[PDB]
């Protein structure tokens, strides 16, 4: 009863303190920065091995190999330089909505409608890729998963829950339960010490991995949050949603910084990533093409239009040399 | 020029041909999506077939292989994962004919049928409707008429008319009758004619897909 009014008053205090900590907008500060100019990105490679729509994709830290997962029951690992298929792992469940590629390169992970995260050991004897481990405990479809190291893995599921697992033990070590809607995205900080997670309640929560409690909560979207990605310095992140708008928040300022939106855009976001320096924002849409925004000027600096269906996954190499976009036409495009 | 890379390219081509043959094998198998409200006959039709958030049931019949996907054991925002089932051959929707008076239940069943039939992803996918528990429906109408569920019902409280009226109510929930077809069958346990009905509907939708592929349609 009175606790609801207490929560209302606390939210009141939070947002007029956030207003009290706002002086000038990002646009007002960055009006003095020269625009990046119209950048033209040409497709350099087309990885054509998948038969169904591609749902996930992840780059290696060496920025050469990339893993991609399709609904045809296969996740395959490509050498992007030569377009050769290094590996082709068949999945026990054809319903895969996420995949991650370990920073060491020794493992890959996948998951989906089966509520199980499967870790495959790439670098083993016997010359085959075998299921190193299966993680169960989530009661909803897995939306995302990232590798903290060779033994710690963070998953987000559609049961409004994120979890940190010890792979060797095989069971959850931490359970983050703050969201109310289905968690659909995930992004680790560059230091892999805290991470953000955007859910279907139009809210993005920031979690401290070590202690397991939510630090800050960010609102501002009207619809489901589909993608999230930290800024390279780790002090900001961008989110995309179904209301066809992206927005850049800030941790220390604790409030939204910029809103990337165009009246010509009416289709929701599916994937968000920054560039090497953070000056560009790459956003994948349902209108079958990617957009490149000036992250500081908030104007569409470019368009990546080469896909015949919606772009479902998008990633940028660690060295920033290229950007890979997957889509529902079963082809990956490596742009540079 | 490709010194030790020639073996890498050969490996790539070989696993590519394995991918090609696996996809060809998977393209010869008919996928069905099983849906329906809770406590319905959704489970009892799997027993009619010869036979965790996803359930897969493989069964073969007359040199045709069916993968039936049950998704009811997953509580999540349906719009976040239903698009995964785009391109499924058909949707098997189970409705309990004995729940017209219990709670109303057919109101939610019709709401779910309307939501899934007119969905943006299943705009043309055929629906096979299984009206289960028809035998239990015999004595439900001798003591409780169809008027409770349908206020505007005007007819004799007989199976041969009430059941037809219910089927007509269910089938007129699609706004695209020229592009999608709804097959209705009152589930019978005699000689497993349900599997034959599924085979006939799947054959019709396969014929339509072939006509589209060849450009005749």
């Amino acid at each position, epitope marked *: 009863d009175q606790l609801r009014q207490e929560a209302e008053q606390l939210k009141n205090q939070i947002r007029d303190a956030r207003k009290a900590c706002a002086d000038a907008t990002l646009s007002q500060i960055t009006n003095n920065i020269d625009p990046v100019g119209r950048i033209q990105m040409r497709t350099r490679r087309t990885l054509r091995g998948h038969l169904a729509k591609i749902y996930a994709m992840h780059w290696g830290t060496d920025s*050469r*190999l990339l893993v991609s997962a399709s609904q045809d029951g296969k996740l395959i690992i490509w*050498d992007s330089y*030569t377009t*050769n298929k*290094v*590996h082709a792992i068949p999945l026990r469940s054809s319903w895969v909505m996420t995949c991650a590629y370990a920073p060491s390169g020794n493992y890959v992970a996948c998951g989906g409608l089966d509520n199980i995260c499967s870790i495959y050991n790439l670098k083993t*004897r*016997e*010359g*085959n890729v075998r299921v190193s481990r299966e993680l169960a405990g989530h009661t909803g479809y897995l939306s995302c998963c990232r590798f903290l190291d060779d033994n710690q893995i963070v998953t987000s599921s559609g049961d409004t829950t994120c979890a940190l697992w010890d792979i060797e033990t095989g069971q959850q070590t931490t359970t983050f339960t703050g969201h109310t809607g289905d968690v659909m995205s995930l992004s680790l900080a560059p230091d892999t010490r805290l991470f953000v997670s955007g859910a279907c309640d139009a809210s993005a929560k920031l979690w401290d991995v070590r202690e397991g409690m939510c630090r800050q909560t960010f609102t501002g979207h009207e619809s489901d949050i589909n993608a999230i990605c930290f800024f390279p310095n780790g002090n900001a992140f961008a989110t995309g949603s179904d209301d066809a708008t992206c927005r850049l928040f800030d941790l220390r300022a604790d409030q939204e910084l910029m809103t990337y939106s165009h009246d010509n855009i009416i289709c929701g976001i599916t994937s968000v990533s920054f560039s090497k320096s953070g000056r560009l924002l790459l956003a994948g849409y349902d209108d079958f093409n990617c957009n490149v925004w000036d992250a500081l000027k908030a104007d569409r600096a470019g368009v990546l239009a080469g896909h015949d269906n919606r772009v479902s996954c998008l990633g940028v190499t660690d060295d920033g040399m290229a950007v890979a976009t997957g889509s529902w036409d079963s082809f990956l495009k490596i742009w540079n | *020029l490709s*010194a*030790e*890379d*020639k*073996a*890498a390219v*050969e*490996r790539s081509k*070989m696993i590519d041909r394995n991918l090609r043959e696996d996809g060809e094998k998977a393209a010869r198998e008919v996928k069905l999506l099983l849906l329906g409200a809770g406590e319905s006959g959704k489970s009892t039709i799997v027993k009619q077939m010869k036979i965790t958030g996803i359930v897969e049931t493989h069964f073969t019949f007359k040199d045709l292989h069916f993968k039936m996907f049950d998704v009811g054991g997953q509580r999540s925002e349906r719009k976040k994962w239903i698009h995964c089932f785009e391109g499924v051959t058909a949707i098997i929707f189970c409705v309990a004919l004995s729940d017209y008076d219990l709670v109303n239940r057919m109101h939610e069943s019709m709401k779910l049928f309307d939501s899934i039939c007119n969905n943006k992803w299943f705009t043309d996918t055929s629906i096979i409707l299984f009206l289960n528990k028809k035998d239990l429906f015999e004595e439900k109408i001798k003591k409780s008429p169809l008027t409770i569920c349908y206020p505007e019902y005007a007819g004799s409280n007989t199976y041969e008319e009430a059941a037809a009226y219910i089927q007509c109510q269910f089938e007129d929930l699609n706004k695209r009758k020229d592009t999608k077809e709804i097959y209705t069958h009152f589930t019978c346990a005699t000689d497993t004619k349900n599997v034959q009905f599924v085979f006939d509907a799947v054959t019709d939708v396969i014929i339509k897909n072939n006509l589209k592929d060849c450009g005749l349609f």
Partner: single-chain antibody
Amino acid sequence: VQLVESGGGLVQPGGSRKLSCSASGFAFSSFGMHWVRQAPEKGLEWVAYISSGSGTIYYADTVKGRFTISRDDPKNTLFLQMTSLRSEDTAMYYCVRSIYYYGSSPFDFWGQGTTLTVSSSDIVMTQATSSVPVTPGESVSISCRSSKSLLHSNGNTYLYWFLQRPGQSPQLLIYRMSNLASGVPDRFSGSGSGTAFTLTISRLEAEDVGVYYCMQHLEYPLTFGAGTKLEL
């Protein structure tokens, strides 16, 4: 992982004989297979190779025509048939595993060996030294030279370093001139540039004395080095 091969023994010169290599413990169908022989008083020499799926076969110029190589993938077996077996073909034959993708470690596992006995353009790899005195706890550096620059246009320097202990099959140490094979202690290190390479062993612990071989992999045929012996 085991590759046990048989089919040796005394053979009348000019006859025929086949060697069978049975493999158990790995996905045999995914590995390319090599036959490499070592004469009773000489170094290693590459004989034959079949790719995965038998789609590509190469033979050394010495045994080309007389020798043929095949595999039975369902039975996980390797076959080398030899016809007109002259007296220069008496040697110990080794069955070698090698898988080629990006970042793989080919030539990583070797069989135990048959002991066939017959009664009576190529890149040249030169290990200048042949025998080196060594004291435990010290550091040594085996050298290798190449007639052609092993460095390729794509940045890979295809040089492999193998170690053969007395009475044992050779063991992979270094692949592509810098990478350590799995299970090899980090004391070994590889370095060098085109046509000049070095294998450095630091704080040399014992029980690794043997013959160090320096093999190229830029072009077929694969030519080994002469061999460098470490003795206490």
